[PDB]
C-alpha cells in the first residue's frame, strides 16, 4: 500500500521572482485576503465614463496647445513668424518634447544651480516613458482673428535635421536660415491657407524617416555640447510663413494669434525604459523663487 518512487530527479533553479518586470504571467505574491480567487468585478458603474481611458490611442489623442503665435501687420513675407513664444513658427514634427525652460537658483554667492523644466502635452508625456516612438502626428492650426483680418499663410513640411541655434544651455531655432531667399518652399509639401472666411486646418503628417523608429530623448539635456539625440527624435518640422502680409483695417487690432493644437494617431512605442539620463521626474513647483527642488540620484 506504500509503494516506491518512480518519478525522476527534477532539475531545479532557485530563482525568487522570475521575470517580475513582464506584464503577463503568473505572479507569486500571497494575497492578504480571505479567498484565493479575490477578484473585483468589471468597471461597470465605477468611473463616470465607460471609455477605456488608458489606451495609448485615447491618451495621445488628447490635444494640447503648443504654440500661440502673434502675426503682426508689420512682419515680412516668406519669413517664419517669430513673435512672442520661443520656437516661433517652427514646429518640430514629433511625439517627444522640444521646448524647455531653465530655472536658475543660488547655492552660494559664486555658484548657480540650473534646472530644466519641460512643458509636456499628453502625448509628449507618454513618449517620455519609452525609448523609441513611431506615430502619425496631427496638428490643428487655428487663427484668432475677426471677420476683417485677411491674409494667406503657408505651412510646409521639411524632413530631416532642423535648423537650430545651439546655445550653451538650450536649443533654439534659426530664423536666419528659413527666409524666402535661402529656404524656398517650392518643393516641400505645403498648404496655403486662406484667411478671408476660413480659420482652421488639420494637418496629418505621417511617419517618414529612414529609421523604423525615432528616439524619444528630445530636448532632454540638449545643448551646444550635446545635440545629436535632439535631431534624431523628430524627422521634420512644420514652418509657418506668410505668403501675403496680414491685411487689416485700422478699426481692428494690428495682431492676430495663431494657435497650434497637437495630438497623435496610430501610435506605437518600443521599449518600456526611458532613454533619458535621469529618471522620469515630475517637476513640483517650489513655493518661492529662492527655494530649491528635489534632485533624484542614480546610484544604487
Amino acid at each position: 500500500s506504500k509503494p516506491r518512487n518512480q518519478q525522476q530527479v527534477c532539475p531545479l533553479q532557485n530563482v525568487p521572482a522570475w521575470g517580475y518586470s513582464l506584464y503577463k504571467g503568473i505572479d507569486m505574491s500571497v494575497p492578504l485576503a480571505y479567498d484565493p480567487n479575490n477578484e473585483l468585478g468589471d468597471l461597470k458603474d465605477v468611473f463616470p465614463s465607460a471609455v477605456d481611458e488608458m489606451a495609448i490611442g485615447y491618451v495621445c489623442g488628447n490635444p494640447a496647445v503648443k504654440h500661440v503665435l502673434t502675426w503682426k501687420t508689420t512682419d515680412a513675407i516668406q519669413k517664419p513668424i517669430a513673435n512672442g513664444d520661443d520656437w516661433g513658427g517652427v514646429i518640430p514634427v514629433g511625439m517627444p518634447c522640444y521646448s524647455k525652460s531653465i530655472r536658475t537658483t543660488r547655492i552660494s554667492a559664486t555658484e548657480n544651480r540650473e534646472t530644466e523644466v519641460m512643458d509636456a502635452a499628453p502625448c509628449e508625456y507618454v513618449a517620455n516613458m519609452f525609448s523609441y516612438w513611431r506615430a502619425t502626428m496631427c496638428y490643428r492650426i487655428t487663427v484668432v482673428k475677426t471677420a476683417f483680418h485677411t491674409g494667406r499663410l503657408e505651412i510646409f513640411f521639411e524632413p530631416g535635421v532642423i535648423p537650430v541655434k545651439p546655445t550653451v544651455n538650450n536649443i533654439g531655432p534659426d530664423q536666419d536660415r528659413l527666409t524666402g531667399a535661402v529656404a524656398p518652399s517650392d518643393n516641400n509639401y505645403k498648404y496655403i491657407l486662406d484667411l478671408t472666411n476660413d480659420t482652421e486646418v488639420t494637418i496629418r503628417v505621417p511617419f517618414v524617416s529612414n529609421k523604423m523608429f525615432l528616439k524619444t530623448a528630445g530636448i532632454y539635456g540638449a545643448n551646444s555640447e550635446n545635440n545629436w539625440n535632439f535631431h534624431e527624435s523628430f524627422s521634420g518640422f512644420l514652418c509657418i510663413r506668410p505668403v501675403t502680409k496680414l491685411m487689416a483695417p485700422d478699426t481692428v487690432s494690428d495682431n492676430v494669434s495663431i494657435v497650434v493644437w497637437k495630438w497623435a494617431e496610430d501610435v506605437v512605442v518600443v521599449e518600456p525604459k526611458p532613454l533619458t539620463s535621469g529618471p522620469t521626474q515630475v517637476y513640483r513647483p517650489p513655493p518661492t523663487a529662492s527655494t530649491a527642488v528635489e534632485v533624484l540620484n542614480v546610484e544604487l
Binding site: 533553479q13 532557485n14 530563482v15 525568487p16 521572482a17 521575470g19 518586470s21 513582464l22 525609448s131 523609441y132 529609421k211 523604423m212 523608429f213 525615432l214 528616439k215 545629436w228 539625440n229 534624431e232 518600443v270 521599449e271 518600456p272 525604459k273 526611458p274 532613454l275 533619458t276 539620463s277 535621469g278 529618471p279 522620469t280 542614480v298 546610484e299 544604487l300
Partner: protein
C-alpha cells in the same frame, strides 16, 4: 581544331562508389548520433567568452566593456562566425557563473539593466526591466536582452549615430568575478556573407 579559348566545363567525379548522401547518413548513425546542418544553431549554444571577469563593488558596468574586447578575438561562436558576415539581427542571451570568494556576513545580489549600445554608465537611468539573483542560493545569473532597435539590421562599426539598439548593464553590491557565456536568442541570426579572414596558430618563442 580552330584557334580560340573555350568553355564547356567537364565535371568529372572519381571513385564511382555510392551516392554520398547515403554514406554520410550511415556514418553518423555510428560515430555522432547528431547531424549538425546549420551554423545558425551554433549561435544558440552558450560558449564562454571569459573565465575571470573581475569587477568592483557598486559600479554599473556595461557589457560593452567586455564584448568590445572579445569581439575581435573570435574565441566563441558569435565572434568567430561574425567574421564571415556583415550584418546581424536579434537579441542576445548571457549567463554569469559566479566564481567569487563570497562572505557570509554580507548579502550579495546581482542586478541587470538595459543601456542602449555604447553609452557609458552615467548617461543612462536605471528605470527599466530588471533582473536580480542572489549568488548564495543561485550562482548563475541568466538574462536575455531583446532586440529593441531603430533599424531592421545592424552593421559592424557604424557612424556617430550611437544608442540605436539596447544592450545589458551589470551591477553588483560586492566586488565579484565571473564566467560570462553568451549566445543568441531564438531570433538571432547573421547575414550578408563575405569571405573569411586569416587564422592564428601557435606561438613557440623560438631560441634564436
Amino acid at each position: 581544331i580552330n584557334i580560340g579559348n573555350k568553355t564547356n566545363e567537364n565535371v568529372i567525379s572519381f571513385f564511382d562508389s555510392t551516392d554520398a548522401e547515403t554514406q554520410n547518413h550511415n556514418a553518423l548513425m555510428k560515430g555522432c548520433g547528431e547531424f549538425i546542418v546549420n551554423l545558425r544553431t551554433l549561435l544558440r549554444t552558450f560558449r564562454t567568452i571569459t573565465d575571470n571577469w573581475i569587477l568592483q563593488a557598486n559600479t554599473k558596468t556595461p557589457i560593452t566593456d567586455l564584448t568590445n574586447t572579445t569581439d575581435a578575438q573570435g574565441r566563441d561562436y558569435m565572434s568567430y562566425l561574425s567574421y564571415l558576415y556583415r550584418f546581424y539581427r536579434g537579441g542576445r542571451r548571457y549567463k554569469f557563473f559566479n566564481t567569487t570568494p563570497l562572505k557570509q556576513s554580507q548579502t550579495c545580489y546581482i542586478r541587470s539593466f538595459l543601456i542602449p549600445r555604447n553609452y557609458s554608465a552615467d548617461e543612462i537611468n536605471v528605470d527599466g526591466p530588471s533582473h536580480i539573483t542572489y549568488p548564495v542560493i543561485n550562482p548563475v545569473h541568466e538574462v536575455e536582452v531583446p532586440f529593441y532597435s531603430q533599424y531592421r539590421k545592424i552593421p559592424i562599426a557604424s557612424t556617430s549615430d550611437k544608442g540605436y539598439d539596447s544592450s545589458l548593464m551589470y551591477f553588483s553590491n560586492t566586488a565579484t568575478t565571473q564566467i560570462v557565456a553568451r549566445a543568441g536568442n531564438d531570433d538571432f541570426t547573421f547575414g550578408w556573407m563575405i569571405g573569411p579572414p586569416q587564422l592564428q596558430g601557435e606561438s613557440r618563442s623560438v631560441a634564436p
